[PDB]
Amino acid sequence: MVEIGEKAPEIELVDTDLKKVKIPSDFKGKVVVLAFYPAAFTSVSTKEMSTFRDSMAKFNEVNAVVIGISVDPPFSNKAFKEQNKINFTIVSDFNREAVKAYGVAGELPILKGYVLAKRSVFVIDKNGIVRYKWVSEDPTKEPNYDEIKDVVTKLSLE
């Protein structure tokens, strides 16, 4: 697992364009926010991602990049990304390598057997250390957007 003191597990996932994205390596020096979401094309996940899209400027200010992660395939995540005018990166963890690594692998009672991510948020600092964690078993609850921003800002100052 990932705990509030450990370096963030180094993972390599492909984005909606099929470009490899190395986390946290490719983001040394800047604060990164990993937003794990259950399934693309769902009310709550759409809302959550749209919310991050909208606050995109606030994040640019503090040199912070938000990355969405779901076990969905790249092609669907791409379609998902465009339809909601999302402009931060979205990567496909199709082998569940990330959900497992970050210990947020779960299952929807309604779709047993389908392994997906529990809506969670992880903020990694400029040095690749996890400094904030939030996980919800209930996929209807959204993150504490404000609390996240505050932490991103505080982390950006070090």
Cβ nearer to its own copies, comparing 79 with 135:
79
- For residues 78 to 97, the per-residue mask of contacts with its own copies, x marking binding by CB under 8 A and - elsewhere, is xxx-------------xx--
Q: Where are the beta strands (DSSP E) in the chain?
A: 11-15, 20-23, 31-36, 64-70, 90-92, 105-107, 115-117, 120-124, 130-135
By CB under 5 A, what part of segment 42-81 binds Cl ion?
42, 44-45
CB of 118 to Cl ion, least distance (A): 10
What mask, x for binding its own copies by CB under 8 A, covers residues 38 to 77? -xxxx----------------------------xxxxxx-
Between 42 and 136, name the residue whose CB sits nearer to Cl ion.
42
Residue 108 amino acid letter: L
Contact 36, 8 (CB under 8 A): no
Residue closer to its own copies (CB basis): 77 or 120: 77
Cis preceding linkage at 74, omega within 30: no
**Binding partner at 157 among its own copies, Cl ion, none, C-beta below 5 to 8 Å by kind:** none
What is the size of the binding site for Cl ion (CB under 5 A)?
6
Residue 108: other Cβ atoms inside 10 A: 14
Smallest gap from Cβ 117 to its own copies, in A, equals: 12
Contact 110, 86 (CB under 8 A): no
Write the CA distances from 58 to 119, 149, 156, integer angstroms: 22, 8, 12
Which residues sit at the interface with Cl ion, rule CB under 5 A? 38-39, 42, 44-45, 139
